[PDB]
Amino acid sequence: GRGWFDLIDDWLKRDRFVFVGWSGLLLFPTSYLSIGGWFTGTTFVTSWYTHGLASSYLEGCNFFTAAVSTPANSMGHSLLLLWGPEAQGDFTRWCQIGGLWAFCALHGSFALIGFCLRQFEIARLVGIRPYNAIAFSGPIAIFVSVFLMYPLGQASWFFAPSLGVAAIFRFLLFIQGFHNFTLNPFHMMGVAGILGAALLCAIHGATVQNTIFEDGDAANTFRAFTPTQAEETYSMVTANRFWSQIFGVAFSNKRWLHFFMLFVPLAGLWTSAIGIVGLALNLRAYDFVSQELRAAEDPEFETFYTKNILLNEGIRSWMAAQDQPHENFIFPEEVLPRGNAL
Amino acid sequence: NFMLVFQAEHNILMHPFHQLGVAGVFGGSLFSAMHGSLVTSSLIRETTENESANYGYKFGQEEETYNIVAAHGYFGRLIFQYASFNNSRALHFFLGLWPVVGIWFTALGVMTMAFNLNGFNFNQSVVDSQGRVINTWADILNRANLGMEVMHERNAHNFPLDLA
Amino acid sequence: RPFSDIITSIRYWIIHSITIPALYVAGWLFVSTGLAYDIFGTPRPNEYFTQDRQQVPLVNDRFSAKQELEDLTKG
Amino acid sequence: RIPLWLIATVGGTLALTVVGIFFYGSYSGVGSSL
């Protein structure tokens, strides 16, 4: 406590309303600089000079169509430092080349780092096992793979997910049309993890709320629990019987149940991260070659896979001109892939 | 295929009920990971070092297998005290509530887009002083929807509108 | 002290009958003055296009980006 | 000294008014197709 480092450590780890910790020296600035940056970029900054779009409430957009659009494609993978050779210290030109996206993303990466360090620090000081910091590794993997490694494998930051709602929907459909990411088995494992985690959440909540022990005489049973009680508030045996005789199998071990609840979403996120890392290099599970050859030689062979491939071609051709204005794609109506009538 | 055609014809992504469903599943994953992490993190020591921690719990035991106070305090320090669910029954009700309500809403959204009450259409919603359209992300999403619309069922449509 | 204990205190509201509306109006004059369009470079409703610039403006070089930005944003 | 139920009532009323002004701006002026 006497030493200066000990004094700083004592103050940082003080038990107050907002725990600061040493990690707070990395979290609170960057996180703040991220969030306000988004609130700045989605409120005043435009995408007119990078995407040809309006992306601010000032330009007229709403919560859906407002976004912090990615930098211009000509920027490549520049760090887009405000003092860098692109903006050269000019705030206005920096915002106009979409450098605010680089600001938000690079500060958000370190904000995620600081928050995981915060989880580790609070787990250490409180004295519990650090399983919450390792479950946030899933979200960290998602952010790193989708916002950093994907554009770094592509031509520029331009193809990163623009920070918005409609921007993210455009990213979803762009990735589907150009990579066919639904066919990617790693995406399949990820959506399996997500939907299974939601399933586990719902079933666990219902089962626990519906095998509660009668610890009161009130019809509303929330007040019949004490935080410090050393008694389980619901019947594990009754829930096990219910799910065993309804579904054939059932959890018998609470610790296994709660580790499973952790493992499913985290495994899903990491699996889908592998798929997006694959998509960064255009290593895409785009096609099944056997069916492509059969449909090439058999013009009566049709599958839902081939219909999806045609839809992807439609997405690419009808989206490229307005989605990649830097390419200057002029596709006449003759060459655009169409169908009869509509 | 059904997904892509549904997006092309109804714009389900911009429809707010599907957004509530996305919130439901993402929040279900978030709360599943969080709850599992905090229960696994505060497991009471009932196991030796050469033995799986799960065997510290015996089926049908009367005592709690983890310290609710420890997890509650850790999560309170993580964000703020008021956010944490000090009550376990309320916690599990919320766990059962969030994904169920989200999936109810998205199922209802698909039920309503069955009768063609589509998601939002902000196409050409921003125009300059002259009155020419400045594109937004809604327009760029519309381009993908239009590509899927034109390419779906290439031989089935004989008339310009996809009313059926 | 607890949140509700502060909110119901009269002093809180003697402070925030004046402090909060001041900045709520400061934002109003921030944008109504047109100052946001100048700080952040956002075109006004009458600045997306201009003579010889009836097409979308795009930066096509990394290092001369400022130069062509002035050139395009000469106005 | 001020009952917190009245504070909550007035604050929620004002917040709903602000969101409704946002909704009106959504049906009027810039950002509206008209």
Binding site: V18 | - | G27, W28 | -
Partner: peptide
Amino acid sequence: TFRWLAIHGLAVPTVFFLGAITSMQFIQR
């Protein structure tokens, strides 16, 4: 002042941006 700093760092930009947004509703093209 750390409580003041945190809560007001959250609040002051929030009210400033909300005033700007409520003004921005009236830009009227």
